[PDB]
Design a protein around this nucleic acid. Structure first.
Ligand SMILES: [Mg+2]
Ligand SMILES: [Mg+2]
Ligand SMILES: [Mg+2]
Ligand SMILES: [Mg+2]
Ligand SMILES: [Mg+2]
Ligand SMILES: [Mg+2]
Ligand SMILES: [Mg+2]
Ligand SMILES: [Mg+2]
Ligand SMILES: [Mg+2]
Ligand SMILES: [Mg+2]
Ligand SMILES: [Mg+2]
Ligand SMILES: [Mg+2]
Ligand SMILES: [Mg+2]
Ligand SMILES: [Mg+2]
Ligand SMILES: [Mg+2]
Ligand SMILES: [Mg+2]
Ligand SMILES: [Mg+2]
Ligand SMILES: [Mg+2]
Ligand SMILES: [Mg+2]
Ligand SMILES: [Mg+2]
Ligand SMILES: [Mg+2]
Ligand SMILES: [Mg+2]
Ligand SMILES: [Mg+2]
Ligand SMILES: [Mg+2]
Ligand SMILES: [Mg+2]
Ligand SMILES: [Mg+2]
Ligand SMILES: [Mg+2]
Ligand SMILES: [Mg+2]
Ligand SMILES: [Mg+2]
Ligand SMILES: [Mg+2]
Ligand SMILES: [Mg+2]
Ligand SMILES: [Mg+2]
Ligand SMILES: [Mg+2]
Ligand SMILES: [Mg+2]
Ligand SMILES: [Mg+2]
Ligand SMILES: [Mg+2]
Ligand SMILES: [Mg+2]
Ligand SMILES: [Mg+2]
Ligand SMILES: [Mg+2]
Ligand SMILES: [Mg+2]
Ligand SMILES: [Mg+2]
Ligand SMILES: [Mg+2]
Ligand SMILES: [Mg+2]
Ligand SMILES: [Mg+2]
Ligand SMILES: [Mg+2]
Ligand SMILES: [Mg+2]
Ligand SMILES: [Mg+2]
Ligand SMILES: [Mg+2]
Ligand SMILES: [Mg+2]
Ligand SMILES: [Mg+2]
Ligand SMILES: [Mg+2]
Ligand SMILES: [Mg+2]
Ligand SMILES: [Mg+2]
Ligand SMILES: [Mg+2]
Ligand SMILES: [Mg+2]
Ligand SMILES: [Mg+2]
Ligand SMILES: [Mg+2]
Ligand SMILES: [Mg+2]
Ligand SMILES: [Mg+2]
Ligand SMILES: [Mg+2]
Ligand SMILES: [Mg+2]
Ligand SMILES: [Mg+2]
Ligand SMILES: [Mg+2]
Ligand SMILES: [Mg+2]
Ligand SMILES: [Mg+2]
Ligand SMILES: [Mg+2]
Ligand SMILES: [Mg+2]
Ligand SMILES: [Mg+2]
Ligand SMILES: [Mg+2]
Ligand SMILES: [Mg+2]
Ligand SMILES: [Mg+2]
Ligand SMILES: [Mg+2]
Ligand SMILES: [Mg+2]
Ligand SMILES: [Mg+2]
Ligand SMILES: [Mg+2]
Ligand SMILES: [Mg+2]
Ligand SMILES: [Mg+2]
Ligand SMILES: [Mg+2]
Ligand SMILES: [Mg+2]
Ligand SMILES: [Mg+2]
Ligand SMILES: [Mg+2]
Ligand SMILES: [Mg+2]
Ligand SMILES: [Mg+2]
Ligand SMILES: [Mg+2]
Ligand SMILES: [Mg+2]
Ligand SMILES: [Mg+2]
Ligand SMILES: [Mg+2]
Ligand SMILES: [Mg+2]
Ligand SMILES: [Mg+2]
Ligand SMILES: [Mg+2]
Ligand SMILES: [Mg+2]
Ligand SMILES: [Mg+2]
Ligand SMILES: [Mg+2]
Ligand SMILES: [Mg+2]
Ligand SMILES: [Mg+2]
Ligand SMILES: [Mg+2]
Ligand SMILES: [Mg+2]
Ligand SMILES: [Mg+2]
Ligand SMILES: [Mg+2]
Ligand SMILES: [Mg+2]
Ligand SMILES: [Mg+2]
Ligand SMILES: [Mg+2]
Ligand SMILES: [Mg+2]
Ligand SMILES: [Mg+2]
Ligand SMILES: [Mg+2]
Ligand SMILES: [Mg+2]
Ligand SMILES: [Mg+2]
Ligand SMILES: [Mg+2]
Ligand SMILES: [Mg+2]
Ligand SMILES: [Mg+2]
Ligand SMILES: [Mg+2]
Ligand SMILES: [Mg+2]
Ligand SMILES: [Mg+2]
Ligand SMILES: [Mg+2]
Ligand SMILES: [Mg+2]
Ligand SMILES: [Mg+2]
Ligand SMILES: [Mg+2]
Ligand SMILES: [Mg+2]
Ligand SMILES: [Mg+2]
Ligand SMILES: [Mg+2]
Ligand SMILES: [Mg+2]
Ligand SMILES: [Mg+2]
Ligand SMILES: [Mg+2]
Ligand SMILES: [Mg+2]
Ligand SMILES: [Mg+2]
Ligand SMILES: [Mg+2]
Ligand SMILES: [Mg+2]
Ligand SMILES: [Mg+2]
Ligand SMILES: [Mg+2]
Ligand SMILES: [Mg+2]
Ligand SMILES: [Mg+2]
Ligand SMILES: [Mg+2]
Ligand SMILES: [Mg+2]
Ligand SMILES: [Mg+2]
Ligand SMILES: [Mg+2]
Ligand SMILES: [Mg+2]
Ligand SMILES: [Mg+2]
Ligand SMILES: [Mg+2]
Ligand SMILES: [Mg+2]
Ligand SMILES: [Mg+2]
Ligand SMILES: [Mg+2]
Ligand SMILES: [Mg+2]
Ligand SMILES: [Mg+2]
Ligand SMILES: [Mg+2]
Ligand SMILES: [Mg+2]
Ligand SMILES: [Mg+2]
Ligand SMILES: [Mg+2]
Ligand SMILES: [Mg+2]
Ligand SMILES: [Mg+2]
Ligand SMILES: [Mg+2]
Ligand SMILES: [Mg+2]
Ligand SMILES: [Mg+2]
Ligand SMILES: [Mg+2]
Ligand SMILES: [Mg+2]
Ligand SMILES: [Mg+2]
Ligand SMILES: [Mg+2]
Ligand SMILES: [Mg+2]
Ligand SMILES: [Mg+2]
Ligand SMILES: [Mg+2]
Ligand SMILES: [Mg+2]
Ligand SMILES: [Mg+2]
Ligand SMILES: [Mg+2]
Ligand SMILES: [Mg+2]
Ligand SMILES: [Mg+2]
Ligand SMILES: [Mg+2]
Ligand SMILES: [Mg+2]
Ligand SMILES: [Mg+2]
Ligand SMILES: [Mg+2]
Ligand SMILES: [Mg+2]
Ligand SMILES: [Mg+2]
Ligand SMILES: [Mg+2]
Ligand SMILES: [Mg+2]
Ligand SMILES: [Mg+2]
Ligand SMILES: [Mg+2]
Ligand SMILES: [Mg+2]
Ligand SMILES: [Mg+2]
Ligand SMILES: [Mg+2]
Ligand SMILES: [Mg+2]
Ligand SMILES: [Mg+2]
Ligand SMILES: [Mg+2]
Ligand SMILES: [Mg+2]
Ligand SMILES: [Mg+2]
Ligand SMILES: [Mg+2]
Ligand SMILES: [Mg+2]
Ligand SMILES: [Mg+2]
Ligand SMILES: [Mg+2]
Ligand SMILES: [Mg+2]
Ligand SMILES: [Mg+2]
Ligand SMILES: [Mg+2]
Ligand SMILES: [Mg+2]
Ligand SMILES: [Mg+2]
Ligand SMILES: [Mg+2]
Ligand SMILES: [Mg+2]
Ligand SMILES: [Mg+2]
Ligand SMILES: [Mg+2]
Ligand SMILES: [Mg+2]
Ligand SMILES: [Mg+2]
Ligand SMILES: [Mg+2]
Ligand SMILES: [Mg+2]
Ligand SMILES: [Mg+2]
Ligand SMILES: [Mg+2]
Ligand SMILES: [Mg+2]
Ligand SMILES: [Mg+2]
Ligand SMILES: [Mg+2]
Ligand SMILES: [Mg+2]
Ligand SMILES: [Mg+2]
Ligand SMILES: [Mg+2]
Ligand SMILES: [Mg+2]
Ligand SMILES: [Mg+2]
Ligand SMILES: [Mg+2]
Ligand SMILES: [Mg+2]
Ligand SMILES: [Mg+2]
Ligand SMILES: [Mg+2]
Ligand SMILES: [Mg+2]
Ligand SMILES: [Mg+2]
Ligand SMILES: [Mg+2]
Ligand SMILES: [Mg+2]
Ligand SMILES: [Mg+2]
Ligand SMILES: [Mg+2]
Ligand SMILES: [Mg+2]
Lengths: 63, 97, 76, 44
RNA sequence: AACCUGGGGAACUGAAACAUCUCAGUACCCAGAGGAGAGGAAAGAGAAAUCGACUCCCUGAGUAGCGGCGAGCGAAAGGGGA
RNA sequence: AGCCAUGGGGGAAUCUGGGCGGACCACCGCCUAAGGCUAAGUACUCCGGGUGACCGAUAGCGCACCAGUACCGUGAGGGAAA
RNA sequence: GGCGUGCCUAUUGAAGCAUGAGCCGGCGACUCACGGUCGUGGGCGAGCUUAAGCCGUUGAGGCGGAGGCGUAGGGAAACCGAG
RNA sequence: GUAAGAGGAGGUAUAGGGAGCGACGCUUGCCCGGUGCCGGAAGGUCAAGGGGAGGGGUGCAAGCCCCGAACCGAAGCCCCGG
RNA sequence: GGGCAGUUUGACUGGGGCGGUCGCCUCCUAAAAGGUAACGGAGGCGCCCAAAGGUCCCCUCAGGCGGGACGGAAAUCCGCCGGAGAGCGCAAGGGUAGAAGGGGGCCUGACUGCGAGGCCUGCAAGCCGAGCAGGGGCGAAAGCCGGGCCUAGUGAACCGGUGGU
């Protein structure tokens, strides 16, 4: 009775204006040590998912 | 039963503190395009009862729209819309706050 | 029985054949060493990956004692 | 042994890896910080 | 009969194991009240120098936030009403 | 991690007094603890009435009928058919 | 005289010496609430819609805009804005 | 048994509880390093608490608030024996 | 402090147990694109290097034969032959002397901000990368430098430490 929004998702995914769904690239908080400078710059951006991306949206909706 | 895709990670830092949610002024965007819809001396009063503001409080005119010549009170203006609206009229800013 | 073991097979090989259109940056060959050498409009990366430097058609060439070369003869 | 190159007249850092016992007691190679531009870095 | 307040108060179960957590202050035991009971005239709310006992409905709100930040839990001010 | 409550220990002041506005301090405000009472709006349905795009005797209350009976069980308890 | 390996279930495979059924009659299993998503039939349209409640009825409806969704996005945020 | 209490026992080490072996006969050897239990006013480690060097927040300030070293702290554990 | 309570005690596996294995790289199996199973056949990885990195300049092996005082199969030197059978830090493979190998000079691009376009791919990851801007290195210059001839040398998220804004 009245769906609860999944907070785990809300806390780490943003649903874009057109429908797409973005989030940060994985592995970047401690994996490094000297990993290429190119690595961490590209791990700095965010991206779009696809099929889970559509699974994702369902976990929100009021959101 | 493995890892979800919840391997992703909360960049959405600044997500909550105990009392949480610090009340503050909510500015609502409204362009000149839907502003040129009517005319006279548009103000927060008009826009709410107009179906454009809806008591969201705080008004900021901005950007895309053709500057209809007239007066218009608001809490804020876009640098861009501010110049367009000066090129055919005059407008004062918010009260105190 | 110390065996029964291997390593994730890397899908390497000629990734774009002669007489194919390519955009600038397209990978032409992923290879172990220099089983193919670069050439007209084709540079290779630290792993030996040959890739197109500009748009055009890809053409191969051989030179015996000199080895085989991949090219990109442009036109657009 | 892990290492992060601190900047002089500042406190910048950089991903690195010393080697300790093998001839390496003084690490002071160059680098380039985003703050300002181009400066020498210590070990630390 | 059920409704109400209080004193005590489980586990299965859910977390696809499980211990925090969940089920739940639920089942149940006990004491007490009455046609109702409870609450109730601010050592209040919380940002407006604003509101003005309490209770009940709508909304705010699945928001704020809580959470092996897992499963999952989940307010209040304000506004519309009795 | 304040606020409300309090099992243990230390332990004031009476308005130039005290509590609060989410550790703490200053400023700016709010409120008067450690006594009590209070109707209405709210909940329920043993009981009475009314009404059903509710059942029509394997349905509908377990019971349309002499049913919490017959019968079963030491007992709590189970429980028909007609 | 010709032809002819029950039914169901489960299975790679059943007439199967695998499962279920003595026979008949009746009972017997994808529902509803709320929240979503898509499709579809309509009303309205940069707008659309009310909730509790109130008035009215006694199978009659109307009032009620508080509120919700939409008209702006990006950013953790301060902030800026068709960026 | 939560407690009050009751059993032990209206008994008192020739008594009572626990454990093993199991009339009677001849017997029951060596190992105490580990484990247990028993002894050991030293020392080592150790909780709250005491202490307070030193440090921090805020205020114009008197202050308020917080962090916190040395040293003094029991059983247990270590250690020395049986 | 099992007197008592709630629980945990993995999977693969010609049944289960005992044994062995669990991620990564190389080769064969693999049937001439890619991919492909078995408790099939063989090996490695959980590092290393401020020189084993950048650039510029220079040099070319292993081996064999002949000759040389210590030497003797092999130390160092001379001659002729020798195209890669050496080397390339480590496993194998591919590659390579028209250098990726060996030596020297100067240097620290084991940069910052990005990144067209792609390889691979269920997701997430993984890999290649021209080019733009900034400030630099070596070179006269054309140019090269975003670590190492390449393919192993590794770990989502969560929770917290540390430095900065
Ligand atoms: Mg609802
Ligand atoms: Mg959740
Ligand atoms: Mg992280
Ligand atoms: Mg961190
Ligand atoms: Mg490290
Ligand atoms: Mg970054
Ligand atoms: Mg798992
Ligand atoms: Mg607040
Ligand atoms: Mg603001
Ligand atoms: Mg906004
Ligand atoms: Mg502005
Ligand atoms: Mg082997
Ligand atoms: Mg294999
Ligand atoms: Mg294989
Ligand atoms: Mg390609
Ligand atoms: Mg390169
Ligand atoms: Mg390389
Ligand atoms: Mg040809
Ligand atoms: Mg040649
Ligand atoms: Mg080391
Ligand atoms: Mg290490
Ligand atoms: Mg190193
Ligand atoms: Mg550097
Ligand atoms: Mg920066
Ligand atoms: Mg009764
Ligand atoms: Mg109760
Ligand atoms: Mg449980
Ligand atoms: Mg549940
Ligand atoms: Mg469970
Ligand atoms: Mg389960
Ligand atoms: Mg279980
Ligand atoms: Mg529990
Ligand atoms: Mg609870
Ligand atoms: Mg309760
Ligand atoms: Mg409780
Ligand atoms: Mg409890
Ligand atoms: Mg009593
Ligand atoms: Mg009573
Ligand atoms: Mg009574
Ligand atoms: Mg009364
Ligand atoms: Mg009452
Ligand atoms: Mg009443
Ligand atoms: Mg009362
Ligand atoms: Mg109440
Ligand atoms: Mg009362
Ligand atoms: Mg304020
Ligand atoms: Mg104001
Ligand atoms: Mg006012
Ligand atoms: Mg009010
Ligand atoms: Mg008052
Ligand atoms: Mg109330
Ligand atoms: Mg009610
Ligand atoms: Mg109501
Ligand atoms: Mg979190
Ligand atoms: Mg879990
Ligand atoms: Mg709860
Ligand atoms: Mg209200
Ligand atoms: Mg109200
Ligand atoms: Mg009402
Ligand atoms: Mg009423
Ligand atoms: Mg306080
Ligand atoms: Mg107390
Ligand atoms: Mg006082
Ligand atoms: Mg006062
Ligand atoms: Mg005072
Ligand atoms: Mg108080
Ligand atoms: Mg207090
Ligand atoms: Mg207050
Ligand atoms: Mg504190
Ligand atoms: Mg107050
Ligand atoms: Mg009194
Ligand atoms: Mg009352
Ligand atoms: Mg009442
Ligand atoms: Mg009612
Ligand atoms: Mg009745
Ligand atoms: Mg009735
Ligand atoms: Mg009736
Ligand atoms: Mg009928
Ligand atoms: Mg009948
Ligand atoms: Mg009944
Ligand atoms: Mg019956
Ligand atoms: Mg009857
Ligand atoms: Mg009856
Ligand atoms: Mg009778
Ligand atoms: Mg009867
Ligand atoms: Mg019956
Ligand atoms: Mg016949
Ligand atoms: Mg026949
Ligand atoms: Mg079978
Ligand atoms: Mg048979
Ligand atoms: Mg038969
Ligand atoms: Mg059988
Ligand atoms: Mg069976
Ligand atoms: Mg059969
Ligand atoms: Mg069957
Ligand atoms: Mg039958
Ligand atoms: Mg049978
Ligand atoms: Mg029978
Ligand atoms: Mg039948
Ligand atoms: Mg029936
Ligand atoms: Mg049915
Ligand atoms: Mg269904
Ligand atoms: Mg519905
Ligand atoms: Mg629905
Ligand atoms: Mg339609
Ligand atoms: Mg239509
Ligand atoms: Mg329509
Ligand atoms: Mg219109
Ligand atoms: Mg409503
Ligand atoms: Mg009225
Ligand atoms: Mg009426
Ligand atoms: Mg009515
Ligand atoms: Mg009516
Ligand atoms: Mg009439
Ligand atoms: Mg009628
Ligand atoms: Mg009506
Ligand atoms: Mg009307
Ligand atoms: Mg309104
Ligand atoms: Mg509205
Ligand atoms: Mg309106
Ligand atoms: Mg109104
Ligand atoms: Mg809503
Ligand atoms: Mg829209
Ligand atoms: Mg935002
Ligand atoms: Mg801006
Ligand atoms: Mg524009
Ligand atoms: Mg006791
Ligand atoms: Mg006690
Ligand atoms: Mg006694
Ligand atoms: Mg006695
Ligand atoms: Mg005796
Ligand atoms: Mg004796
Ligand atoms: Mg005795
Ligand atoms: Mg004895
Ligand atoms: Mg005895
Ligand atoms: Mg003897
Ligand atoms: Mg003897
Ligand atoms: Mg002896
Ligand atoms: Mg001993
Ligand atoms: Mg001893
Ligand atoms: Mg023992
Ligand atoms: Mg002792
Ligand atoms: Mg002792
Ligand atoms: Mg001592
Ligand atoms: Mg200590
Ligand atoms: Mg001490
Ligand atoms: Mg202390
Ligand atoms: Mg202390
Ligand atoms: Mg001091
Ligand atoms: Mg200091
Ligand atoms: Mg100070
Ligand atoms: Mg001072
Ligand atoms: Mg104080
Ligand atoms: Mg001491
Ligand atoms: Mg003492
Ligand atoms: Mg001591
Ligand atoms: Mg001691
Ligand atoms: Mg011990
Ligand atoms: Mg010890
Ligand atoms: Mg234990
Ligand atoms: Mg229990
Ligand atoms: Mg447990
Ligand atoms: Mg476990
Ligand atoms: Mg098994
Ligand atoms: Mg086996
Ligand atoms: Mg078998
Ligand atoms: Mg097998
Ligand atoms: Mg077999
Ligand atoms: Mg065995
Ligand atoms: Mg055995
Ligand atoms: Mg095994
Ligand atoms: Mg892995
Ligand atoms: Mg795998
Ligand atoms: Mg081969
Ligand atoms: Mg194989
Ligand atoms: Mg193959
Ligand atoms: Mg074939
Ligand atoms: Mg295999
Ligand atoms: Mg290792
Ligand atoms: Mg190694
Ligand atoms: Mg090397
Ligand atoms: Mg090298
Ligand atoms: Mg000789
Ligand atoms: Mg000599
Ligand atoms: Mg000599
Ligand atoms: Mg040869
Ligand atoms: Mg070779
Ligand atoms: Mg060498
Ligand atoms: Mg070999
Ligand atoms: Mg090789
Ligand atoms: Mg070559
Ligand atoms: Mg070279
Ligand atoms: Mg060299
Ligand atoms: Mg060299
Ligand atoms: Mg050198
Ligand atoms: Mg060099
Ligand atoms: Mg030298
Ligand atoms: Mg472009
Ligand atoms: Mg792309
Ligand atoms: Mg890309
Ligand atoms: Mg592809
Ligand atoms: Mg992908
Ligand atoms: Mg997926
Ligand atoms: Mg991806
Ligand atoms: Mg890898
Ligand atoms: Mg890598
Ligand atoms: Mg580049
Ligand atoms: Mg330069
Ligand atoms: Mg020149
Ligand atoms: Mg480059
Ligand atoms: Mg390089
Ligand atoms: Mg190397
Ligand atoms: Mg090199
Ligand atoms: Mg790993
Ligand atoms: Mg590891
Ligand atoms: Mg790792
Ligand atoms: Mg992680
Ligand atoms: Mg976790
Ligand atoms: Mg953190
Ligand atoms: Mg920090």
């Amino acid at each position: 009775p009245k769906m609860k929004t999944h907070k785990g998702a809300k806390k780490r995914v943003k649903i874009t204006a057109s429908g797409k769904v973005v989030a940060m690239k994985t592995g970047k908080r401690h994996l490094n040590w000297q990993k290429s400078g190119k690595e961490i710059r590209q791990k700095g951006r965010k991206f779009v998912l696809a099929k889970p991306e559509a699974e994702r949206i369902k976990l929100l909706l009021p959101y | 039963g493995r890892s979800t895709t919840l391997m992703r990670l909360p960049k959405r830092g600044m997500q909550g503190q105990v009392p949480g949610e610090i009340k503050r002024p909510r500015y609502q965007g409204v362009n000149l395009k839907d502003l040129a819809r009517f005319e006279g001396e548009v103000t927060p009063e008009l826009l709410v009862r107009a179906g454009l503001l809806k008591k969201g409080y705080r008004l900021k005119i901005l950007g895309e729209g053709e500057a209809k010549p007239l007066k218009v009170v608001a809490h804020a203006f876009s640098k861009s819309a501010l110049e367009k609206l000066k090129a055919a009229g005059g407008e004062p800013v918010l009260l105190e706050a | 029985t110390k065996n029964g073991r291997d390593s994730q097979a890397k899908r390497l090989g000629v990734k774009r054949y002669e007489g194919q259109v390519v955009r600038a940056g397209n990978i032409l060959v992923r290879q172990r060493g220099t089983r193919f050498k670069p050439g007209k409009n084709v540079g290779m990366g630290r792993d030996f990956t040959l890739f197109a430097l500009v748009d055009g058609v890809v053409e191969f060439q051989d030179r015996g004692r000199l080895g085989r070369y991949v090219h990109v003869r442009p036109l657009a | 042994l892990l290492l992060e190159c601190t900047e002089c007249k500042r406190r910048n850092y950089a991903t690195e890896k010393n080697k300790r016992n093998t001839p390496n007691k003084l690490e002071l190679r160059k680098y380039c910080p985003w703050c300002r531009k181009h400066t020498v870095h210590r070990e630390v």
